[PDB]
Amino acid sequence: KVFGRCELAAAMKRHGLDNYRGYSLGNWVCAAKFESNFNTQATNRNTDGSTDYGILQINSRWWCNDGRTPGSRNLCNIPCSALLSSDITASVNCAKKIVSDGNGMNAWVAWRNRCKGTDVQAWIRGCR
Numbered sequence: 269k270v271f272g273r274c275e276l277a278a279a280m281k282r283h284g285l286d287n288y289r290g291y292s293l294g295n296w297v298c299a300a301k302f303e304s305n306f307n308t309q310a311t312n313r314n315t316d317g318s319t320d321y322g323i324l325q326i327n328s329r330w331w332c333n334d335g336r337t338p339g340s341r342n343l344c345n346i347p348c349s350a351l352l353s354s355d356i357t358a359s360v361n362c363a364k365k366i367v368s369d370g371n372g373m374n375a376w377v378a379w380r381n382r383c384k385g386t387d388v389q390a391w392i393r394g395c396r
């Protein structure tokens with residue numbers, strides 16, 4: 269599924285992302301735009317063998333199992349493919365664990381370089 273901006277914002281809000289660990293909703297929508305272009309099916313391979321999956325490009329090194337990343341962990345206890353679903357529940361729940369780990373949203377490289385320090389509110393402007 270490729271989400272619309274406001275559609276995604278409302279889904280994210282429903283699952284408790286607005287102000288989660290102090291990050292306003294516009295930060296999350298911003299990150300998803302530049303991580304995946306709002307597409308739940310996005311995948312990107314990294315140089316070390318691991319792969320990033322879903323709207324928030326969660327990495328198979330630590331967070332999910334894809335059966336081809338040897339010596340990796342599965343801290344969200346899910347198949348990586350579950351992160352490619354039209355239903356973003358699993359993505360959201362795993363992201364809650366990541367942003368809680370000490371590093372905040374800096375774990376998302378595109379957020380740090382393209383969203384941090386900017387007017388993130390603009391990403392939910394117009395939405396009901």
Ligand SMILES: C[C@@H](O)CN1CCN(CC(=O)O)CCN(CC(=O)O)CCN(CC(=O)O)CC1
């Ligand atoms: C609602 C309109 O905005 C839709 N839009 C009409 C044409 N736009 C006009 C404009 O955005 O100023 C110019 C191109 N637009 C540039 C951009 O947005 O960054 C990229 C494509 N957009 C992506 C998007 O807008 O979500 C879809 C089509």
Ligand SMILES: C[C@@H](O)CN1CCN(CC(=O)O)CCN(CC(=O)O)CCN(CC(=O)O)CC1
Binds near residue numbers: 390
């Ligand atoms: C041409 C317009 O698109 C200009 N736009 C500024 C005003 N936009 C208007 C809108 O997107 O409706 C609202 C904010 N916009 C939300 C979003 O893009 O999803 C984030 C910043 N955009 C990033 C981008 O467009 O890729 C920069 C250029």
Ligand SMILES: [Gd]
């Ligand atoms: Gd824009």
